[PDB]
Symmetry: D3
Amino acid sequence: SLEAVTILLADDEAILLLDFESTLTDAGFLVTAVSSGAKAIEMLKSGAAIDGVVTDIRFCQPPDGWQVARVAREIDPNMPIVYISGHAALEWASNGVPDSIILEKPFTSAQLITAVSQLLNARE
Amino acid sequence: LEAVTILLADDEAILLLDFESTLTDAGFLVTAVSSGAKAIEMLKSGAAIDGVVTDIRFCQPPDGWQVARVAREIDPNMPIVYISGHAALEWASNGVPDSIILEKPFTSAQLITAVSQLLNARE
Amino acid sequence: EAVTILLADDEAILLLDFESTLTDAGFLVTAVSSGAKAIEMLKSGAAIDGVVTDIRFCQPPDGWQVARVAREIDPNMPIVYISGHAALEWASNGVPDSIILEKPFTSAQLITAVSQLLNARE
Amino acid sequence: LEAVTILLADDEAILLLDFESTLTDAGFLVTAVSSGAKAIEMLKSGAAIDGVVTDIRFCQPPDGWQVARVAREIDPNMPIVYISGHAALEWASNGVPDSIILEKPFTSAQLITAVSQLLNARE
Amino acid sequence: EAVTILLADDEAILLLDFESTLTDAGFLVTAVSSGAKAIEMLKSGAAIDGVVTDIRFCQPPDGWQVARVAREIDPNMPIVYISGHAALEWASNGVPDSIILEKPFTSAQLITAVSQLLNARE
Amino acid sequence: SLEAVTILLADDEAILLLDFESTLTDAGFLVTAVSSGAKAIEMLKSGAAIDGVVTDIRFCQPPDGWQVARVAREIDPNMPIVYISGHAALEWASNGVPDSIILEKPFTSAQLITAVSQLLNARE
């Protein structure tokens, strides 16, 4: 929308999706929350106004978060991309898109918000 | 000093109020003004201003480009954040070095992060 | 687990203030009143994810030394210095990729500095 | 295109010659001019210019600040390197975003590195 | 020893040109004509300090894949892409902290890109 | 001087000092070449026009290169600092000054020149 910044948030588990979602809405973002990579890509391809993408690396089934980010960057080459991972962050070195941030658990609400805001601000 | 003061200049009162409250909740003192003319007057008065957040365009001249120049003449290291509903094309030829430009809409968190990062990088 | 910040400042009023700022933002904080206690904490094998330290304390060693100890343990340790007096000592004494905050600074500035340095580890 | 072309503007012929030869040895084509007026004329003519290296001050107006603005109006991503024998105080309020300012003296290697890094960072 | 750059480009005239540029600057160069040969080199355990690769080759795999293999072996591997066609594919395909050079570029640009990425390893 | 950029170069061994020296003079720099940290510090303290410092970490005797850089930064807080080391570069993480570059052997002439020029250019 014209009034708000929309973040596509893609996370599997109920506890975390709502945790990340409320963190982002408290900071002033609109959140489109989805529970798979496939659903995230569908949304990206739908023509919906998406200003940044916060995505898990692994979902229950492919496509993974690496692929979500590639689709986002095809639509918008400057798209803010934050990956959220449990364990292996070293895969980012070979799979992450340029100028993305990966956050590996544990991380704080402040870290998530700073990452998202910094990347949106860097758009120029 | 005892405080960190942000000069905030925007001709949309709703935006001015919203940004003022977000910045004050974040720990900043805010001098909120409605025109580039008043921002420049605040700067030229000699008030202690630690960062400037300005719209690029107002109803009347001077514009935000000029506000940032006066600020930088006073303090060459001044944190400068531009607010716009257009205009990064204009920023490319008119913006001062090391400034941030935020295109509307942006969240409270974005403004806070921009201001804070520039203040933290100072020297 | 959690993200823990070691915070070292010899003024109780400031220590409490910086501590509450950081806990509100989601960090656990180990708040200590000297550089010596900070170094003791760092060497104990306690899980520390970032260090926010004053430069000058009542007792030696100074915060410049706290940072060196921290970086010996973890070469990528986020380091934020707090200062009120000589911030230009940082140019000759600070560790690489560190941030120095000169008083006065806001809660937001502290949160941003800590958060951006943690995020940069990738 | 087939070449990478740098517009180089300086009113000191010895410097102009020296920078021209360093840049050409490094692989660039150089359009070397002696004033801001001629640099702007080159820009407004529609010649393919991939980077601008300009002195801040010439004998007559327009100055290097204005040369960089015209360049950035044409191409908002234009690599801009300023050459000065003073003036970073002036750069703080007059320079365009993402530009480099080199204070005299600087080596051939510095100019090459500045131009190359800005070209490499483009997009 | 030496600093070795793996260079992959399927045009012999360009490969020779980029190779001479890099050897004149002090690098050893392993010059290969395909992404497949580059990946074979990377997986062999040969000491490679940086990779400069075309995006499109005659045979598969492409340079985007060369970079991923390089980064699997070394997560901090300097990566420079060379392209003439779609450089905007980099936004969605490039690895983090890589540089893409779009033709035309000068010898200086190539040397600067490789050198600055090597230097950033610290 | 007004005409040239002066680099203080501090290196122990004859082969390398002359190698680094000629690399820097070919690139257009004036080089003040010294063979110890003590001599480098003396020069820095003499009031000589020094625009950047390229220094070894270890000399035959203390003061070391870490200390050379601290002295340089006391004189000029913006001084370009490039360290040159054989083996242990990880000591830079705890001992290097902010915004310095460390080059660990082997490195090329291009790398040295790029490091020096980039840091001089970043002075603003």
